[PDB]
Design an enzyme around this catalytic site. Structure first.
Site, PDB file in Angstrom:
ATOM      1  CE1 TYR A  49     -19.600  12.769  42.023  1.00 15.02           C
ATOM      2  CE2 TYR A  49     -21.962  13.345  41.958  1.00 15.02           C
ATOM      3  CZ  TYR A  49     -20.642  13.691  42.264  1.00 15.02           C
ATOM      4  OH  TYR A  49     -20.306  14.942  42.804  1.00 15.02           O
ATOM      5  CD  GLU A  51     -17.064  15.232  41.263  1.00 17.68           C
ATOM      6  OE1 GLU A  51     -15.838  15.003  41.255  1.00 17.68           O
ATOM      7  OE2 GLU A  51     -17.665  15.704  42.287  1.00 17.68           O
ATOM      8  CG  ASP A 185     -35.388  32.414  33.633  1.00 14.55           C
ATOM      9  OD1 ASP A 185     -35.554  31.389  32.930  1.00 14.55           O
ATOM     10  OD2 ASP A 185     -35.508  32.404  34.879  1.00 14.55           O
ATOM     11  CB  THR A 211     -37.068  25.172  33.767  1.00  9.53           C
ATOM     12  OG1 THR A 211     -38.237  25.690  33.135  1.00  9.53           O
ATOM     13  CG2 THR A 211     -36.814  26.050  34.963  1.00  9.53           C
ATOM     14  CE  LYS A 214     -40.615  26.891  35.138  1.00  7.06           C
ATOM     15  NZ  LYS A 214     -41.168  27.775  36.149  1.00  7.06           N
TER      16      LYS A 214
HETATM   17  C1  LIG Z   1     -42.594  27.877  39.084  1.00  4.57           C
HETATM   18 AS1  LIG Z   1     -43.982  29.249  39.185  1.00  4.57          AS
HETATM   19  C2  LIG Z   1     -43.653  30.246  40.852  1.00  4.57           C
HETATM   20  O1  LIG Z   1     -43.976  30.269  37.795  1.00  4.57           O
HETATM   21  O2  LIG Z   1     -45.573  28.527  39.258  1.00  4.57           O
HETATM   22  C1  LIG Z   2     -19.602  11.681  45.673  1.00 10.68           C
HETATM   23 AS1  LIG Z   2     -17.659  11.675  46.027  1.00 10.68          AS
HETATM   24  C2  LIG Z   2     -17.129  13.555  46.073  1.00 10.68           C
HETATM   25  O1  LIG Z   2     -17.129  10.992  47.521  1.00 10.68           O
HETATM   26  O2  LIG Z   2     -16.952  10.685  44.772  1.00 10.68           O
END
Ligand SMILES: C[As](C)(=O)[O-]
Ligand SMILES: C[As](C)(=O)[O-]
Ligand code: NA
Lengths: 400, 410
Positions: A49, A51, A185, A211, A214
């Protein structure tokens, strides 16, 4: 032997791998990822993780993660020709939401096609445009006239069921004429943008989102692109800490892999086959006299068919086709008269069958079956015969 | 042989594997997932997009996905004793967002455990059409005991009148009394939400009292102590709330769920239902307490609240280095990762802090026990005392390697 600990789960996974093999997937937003993309998301990068952004992390231990993310960033920039990329949005909707946060205020008007709203729908005033009633094409003069009445702060171009090429220079001209930002988009067409078969929005949109799944054929996730350094900096802050915590680095690895695959010359062929396969299926409906293809055809990976002269509505059509191992979705057509739960249409897409190797012959067959299955919706013994035929085809085109 | 196509990406994965091997992870929210959890996430379920809930999907092709998701739901219900579970939230922040959308209105007052007693850091707070989110009012711990004072929290809640009280903390080391939180919420007319993300694995192991019978809604991440994939989970015993939550999550906040991640949630949940998970939780508790003891005994370090009953604790490092940020950088020199962290009534600037936060889950999941945990904290003490001596840091770094080599990660 972890699978021996949890058979209920791991047998359900084999059952899905089997189901996918026996299904013909024509849902236009679906695809079939490479083994490498799957393996990338299945790595121990999920344990870290991290950040912040590369070179500017809050916690230590991130030198390698920085290399991985920088690869995804650079490949995205390269592939789509943009100066700035952020690969940390967890989804296409988070990517969009960051753009809203960076460019406009709560309450501002956003125009978009055929309503990219998601969880932002109560934060902004979304106003819809679609296509001309007769031509079923975008009408840039009507869209401009609408934008002069509504005065949006932001215009969104991109849609999940338009079959024709979008003129992004004209959208930016419209935006500039009323002083709005343009966002595109490109989620549905991003792979065709990457293959060269759809014109790019990158030179015209203030910000482009997508995305990674797709047509681009990657993992579930988002991406944001811009050429404007002041906007990049807002975008980066909106994604973190504004909308998200730390990124999914294992998914970012998988974005990297997919972006490299899309940079390969072979991806241009895939995109050509996507275009051809969609065209072939749309031709079968075009020829027949009782089905109408919206706009008369397609220049992308999908089309809509009005099925109401043969079955009652798009919902019925979807159910009937599920009977023969073909999945797709019902879909409103332009100026739809029926109920949003019923619709007059279906939406048919080519990327997934193309990614399992099918060509125009196969695509044409599949659409013959659809016609036949729909024409005989009330004849279960026919449905069963198409189902048998579908199995021959799926057997001949192994999924993995 | 896909790796031959992209050696630059695949060599980087190998380098991160080796970097994790050589690192002592003391970030309290980190863990080490099983091979089965990773594999689950890396399945072809990623190809199937299924909007809706099981048996109520929009598209067809969803019969097997329904089984997988129902397995996760049933396992979550069974593990945590909840009547309703939603496993679709993509993250812990979304699960929290769904809760806010289901129970309160934009601009309502929400009391939550401040960002230093030991509190979270709200990403993705839903935003109304006029730009309101919520009026966040924080409560703390008592300045002298550094424990939660339920009478002072009640008194505050009576002045402030929140509609929602949130309990749960990313840096509080002592047992939370969820029954009291519920009593305070009932007293002022508020809902109680509990974000158990940090302690969920201890809740699951029997080592921390469950919030589930007391919170109107409980949220958690599936990663951290529960040791599963990145993602969220919402629990409730109230059917009317469950119905609101389910709509808030989809289509209110999300589209279709990540079914491969949901598979990994089912995997992790089953691991946690296993009797060995209770041993993991015990070791987590023991390993943290052994580290904290080294700091307690040393005269120039102070553990917040004097110790711990969970997976983590905070230390004031300011008698020995200037701030928590310095401490964090110093320890990184010795292959030990942790984070700086404010302490209650923090006097330093949020970018410096007086403290470090240390956690045991990831060393425990590598097989380390109390002797190792103690050795690690002595190394930290030594590293910090000798922050300006790179030859001492180098030597501690070489001893860390002997330890990491003896406890392989995978
Ligand atoms: C992600 As769709 C609502 O274009 O199938
Ligand atoms: C996932 As954390 C904000 O406790 O390091
Ligand atoms: Na026709």
């Amino acid at each position: 032997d972890y699978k021996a600990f949890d058979p209920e789960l791991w047998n359900a996974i084999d059952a899905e791998a089997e189901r996918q093999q026996n299904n013909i997937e024509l849902i236009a937003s679906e695809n079939v990822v490479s083994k490498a993309v799957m393996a990338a998301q299945g790595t121990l990068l999920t344990n870290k993780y991290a950040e912040g952004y590369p070179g500017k992390r809050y916690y230590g231990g991130t030198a390698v993660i920085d290399v991985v993310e920088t690869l995804a960033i650079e490949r995205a920039k390269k592939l789509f020709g943009a100066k700035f990329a952020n690969v940390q949005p967890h989804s296409g909707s988070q990517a969009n939401a960051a753009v809203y946060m960076s460019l406009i205020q709560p309450g501002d008007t956003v125009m978009g096609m055929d309503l990219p709203v998601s969880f932002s729908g109560k934060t902004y005033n979304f106003v819809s445009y679609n296509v001309d009633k007769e031509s079923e094409l975008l009408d840039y003069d009507a869209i401009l006239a609408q934008a002069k009445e509504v005065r949006p702060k932001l215009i969104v171009a991109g849609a999940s069921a338009y079959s024709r090429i979008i003129d992004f220079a004209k959208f930016r001209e419209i935006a500039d004429a009323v002083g709005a930002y343009l966002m595109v988009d490109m989620a549905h067409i991003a792979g065709l943008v990457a293959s060269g078969h759809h014109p790019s929005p990158v030179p015209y949109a203030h910000v482009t989102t997508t995305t990674t799944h797709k047509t681009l054929r990657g993992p579930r996730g988002g991406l944001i692109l811009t050429d404007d350094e002041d906007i990049a900096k807002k975008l980066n802050s909106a994604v973190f800490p504004g909308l998200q915590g730390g990124p999914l680095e294992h998914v970012i690895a998988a974005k990297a892999v997919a972006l490299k695959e899309a940079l390969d010359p072979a991806f241009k062929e895939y995109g050509e086959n996507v275009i051809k396969n969609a065209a072939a299926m749309a031709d079968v409906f075009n020829q027949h006299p009782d089905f109408r293809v919206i706009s008369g055809g397609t220049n992308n990976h999908l089309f809509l068919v009005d099925v109401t002269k043969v079955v009652e509505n798009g919902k019925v059509a979807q159910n009937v086709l599920e009977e023969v191992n073909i999945t797709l979705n019902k879909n409103s057509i332009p100026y739809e008269q029926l109920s949003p739960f019923k619709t007059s249409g279906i939406r048919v897409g080519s990327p997934a069958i193309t990614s399992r190797g099918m060509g125009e012959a196969e695509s044409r067959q599949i659409a013959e079956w659809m016609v036949e299955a729909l024409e005989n919706h009330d004849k279960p013994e026919v449905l069963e015969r198409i189902r048998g035929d579908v199995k021959v085809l799926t057997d001949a085109f192994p999924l993995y």
